[PDB]
């Protein structure tokens, strides 16, 4: 599965989840901890915001 831009949630305005919905992968809390440990502030901001 792969996705560039697709559907978004009604309330949270976030990408959906699952292959059937052409969703996006989840960047959970542990991923954010890993990015913080690396120091990649800009990649983390990209994932959170844009």
């Amino acid at each position: 599965h792969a996705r560039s831009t697709g559907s978004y949630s009604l309330v949270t305005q976030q990408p959906l989840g699952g292959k059937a919905q052409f969703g996006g992968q989840r960047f959970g809390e542990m991923e954010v901890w890993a990015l913080e440990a690396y120091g990649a502030a800009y990649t983390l901001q990209e994932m959170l915001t844009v």
Binding site: H1, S4, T5
Partner: peptide, 16 residues
């Protein structure tokens, strides 16, 4: 806080 703010589903992502 934990489902949508501290972690999110993101675009430009894939899995295999």
């Amino acid at each position: 806080f934990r489902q949508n703010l501290l972690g999110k589903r993101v675009d430009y992502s894939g899995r295999s």
